Amino acid sequence: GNVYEDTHFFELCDKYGIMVWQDFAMGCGNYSQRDNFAAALEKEAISVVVKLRNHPSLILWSGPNNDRVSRQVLSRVIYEFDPTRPYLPSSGYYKDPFYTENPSQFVSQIGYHGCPNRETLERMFSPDSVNPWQNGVVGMWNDEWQTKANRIYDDKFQGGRNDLMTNQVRIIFGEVPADLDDFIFASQSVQAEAMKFFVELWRGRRPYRTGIIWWNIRDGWPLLSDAISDYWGGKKQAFYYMQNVHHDVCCLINPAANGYMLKVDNNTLKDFEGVVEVKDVASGKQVFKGKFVSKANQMSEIATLPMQKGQGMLVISYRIEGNEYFNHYLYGEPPYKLDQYRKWVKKCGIYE
């Protein structure tokens, strides 16, 4: 749905070792099968392929099985002008079996909504519209928050995409906080735990799972979206959660049949040794502590942790080569108590 980024974007991806999966500018829906559209698209594909085919970061081109666009026009361009890269004609509880039973090895995670940082709300909303509740009614959004939910045409209605925010907060924390700052932290915490769970769930299911690309790191406009950082650079709570589960060597906990499985995932070509410690936040009881060997380019099971009582949150402290890395795991079933969850994150000392 986006334009083709210019040369400098690929230069930074080349410099910082970030592989690029490039879609052709095609949106949701089927397109024309006639000569005029094919010729206009062939001219575009040939131009963009010759311009970008020299960047090492670029690794793939991407475009019912009779679509001339994806199965002919775009494929012929790649066949003649870039035979070195593959071409792929591809055209509310986060622990629901809808997510946890995805059969795809390479997943495009849908992402979870999250209210931006308060500074962004006061910058893109009118002073009277900073508070989301119209006339103070908990359940209703004003006309401005509905606009920042992407209402393409000014059709006055109530509900829709904006309900995705309060629904997620209600599933995890029971009720929707009336206070604005209590709502921002709650909605950001839901997005933070949900997105962290997806990355940990796919890293922990290797070698069958081969990749995960989530929606998304940054917004292109001051909006209420499922991105983890806004247009003005405001990193949401999810950004920091994802950062700790994106490490080259990450110790994480996955749900198991009769408890939890402590594991370590290696996204490098080198082996590593370390020591991991698992403790409960509130009680401080050490659940597990021992040495692990993280073999290269694979995930390794460390130990099966016994099931804990009720709700709570665990602390995963692991040291590799004299560097202390940290992670956590929220155990129990929702709804959780927002003040109690805030106490767990505070006592843990990983985030703020």
Add this chain to the structure above:
Amino acid sequence: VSEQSLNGRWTLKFFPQPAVPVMTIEGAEAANGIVVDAVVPGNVEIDMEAAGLVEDPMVGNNIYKLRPYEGYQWYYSRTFAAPVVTEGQRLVLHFGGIDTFAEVYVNGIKVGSADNMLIEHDYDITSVVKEGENRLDVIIRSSVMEAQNHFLGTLSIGNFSNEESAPVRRAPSTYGWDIMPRLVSAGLWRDVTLRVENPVTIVDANWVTLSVNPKAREASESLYLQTRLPFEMHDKVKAVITISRDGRQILRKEALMRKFANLFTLNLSGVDAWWPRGYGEPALYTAEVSLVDVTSGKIYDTKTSKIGFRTVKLELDEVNLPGQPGQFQFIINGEPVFAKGTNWVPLDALHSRDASHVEEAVQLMVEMNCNIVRCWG
């Protein structure tokens, strides 16, 4: 009606191609070049050696001394008397071979633009020809420089065939191979003639052997005939088909032309099948078709060619490497023939001399007793 030949002595003016190639007569005459006598059909290198301007490229390293001329232009020019054309008749200017990218002018009017040295080129000059002396001008540009009008795909670069050969329709071996030298050359390397066609004329006579029975000396032959036929001539012209061999007429069939395109099937008796060497005789029959006026008896056109009653089928292997190269056998007239023969490479780097070597070269295969020959791409 007639075929006047334009072969013979022409005027050849050559000069280095400028940044903007010369496409017009004015620019060709304005360019500073050398004018020498030329022979058609011919190659420009032959005309310059006749003028004492280039050494014999067949001797020593003289072949490399033709390198600068790959970026030259070649201006053929001659006059010709116009044949007599009556109402409805068409005057066609026929080129057997233009090498390669040329603009053809007749009396200062562009009648065509050529860009393929391997096929014939025919232009209708009926409306541009004048009574008396006419002028014919052909301005050829550099074939090598023509390649830079294209952007090659990745797979077109680095192959054994020259990159200059990829985007143009020329013989790839002319750019250099391991068996044939690099000699791009240029010129009118085949016949140039003037053809007069009646309003009633044969467009194509396609002979097809449907079936053959060599034992019973029978064959079913089809004639796919396409003609140009004015509607005033519908039902007034007849097609006269004639099959003969060694002067003896085998069949004479007549049919009224009620359409411009018809299919004629002939069930023949006492006819021998065409066989490759060793497997029998290469029996050929003269197949002639003429469009004749039913009333006046005027013969409007006649197409004659020697055909052979033969069927070919390629039986592909389905067990020992099915689909891999070489896993097939030719089935001629129902029999599995064993093919033994040679590959056909260019007869001459200057291809206008090809026709002068065909007789000797084919006779080599006859002495060798080749029943097959593959004409190399």
